[PDB]
Write a protein that binds this ligand. Structure first.
Ligand code: SF4
Ligand code: F3S
Length: 106
């Protein structure tokens, strides 16, 4: 399963959803998650993230391990997203800011 980590929060570019063959992304107010049972690990989404927020589950940074379980839990309650939309308005002010998990909205 591929995992979306911190730098997606408040950027949410959604570029990643075009390339997913199986529509494994689920949508929240300011973040996306990958559903782990649906992901076929094709890796096509992680070159497409401008915020370079997607990782293979086995490559998630040590200080971002919470995001593996977070993707699995929020994909169960968030709506599936299958079309790209505009990035959130202030997405490049927040691109690259560390510590954005405190800003996640359910
Ligand atoms: S690795 Fe593939 S199947 Fe998984 S979310 Fe990404 S594009 Fe989709
Ligand atoms: S910022 Fe997020 S919405 Fe997708 S393109 Fe990157 S994982």
């Amino acid at each position: 399963a591929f995992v979306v980590t911190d730098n997606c929060i408040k950027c949410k570019y959604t570029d990643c959803v075009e390339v997913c063959p199986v529509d494994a992304f689920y949508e929240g107010p300011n973040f996306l998650v990958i559903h782990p049972d649906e992901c076929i690990d094709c890796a096509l989404c992680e070159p497409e993230c401008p915020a370079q927020a997607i990782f293979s589950e086995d490559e998630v940074p040590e200080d971002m391990q919470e995001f593996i379980q977070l993707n699995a839990e929020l994909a169960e309650v968030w709506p599936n997203i299958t079309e790209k939309k505009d990035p959130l308005p202030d997405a490049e002010d927040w691109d690259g800011v560390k510590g954005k998990l405190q800003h996640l909205e359910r």
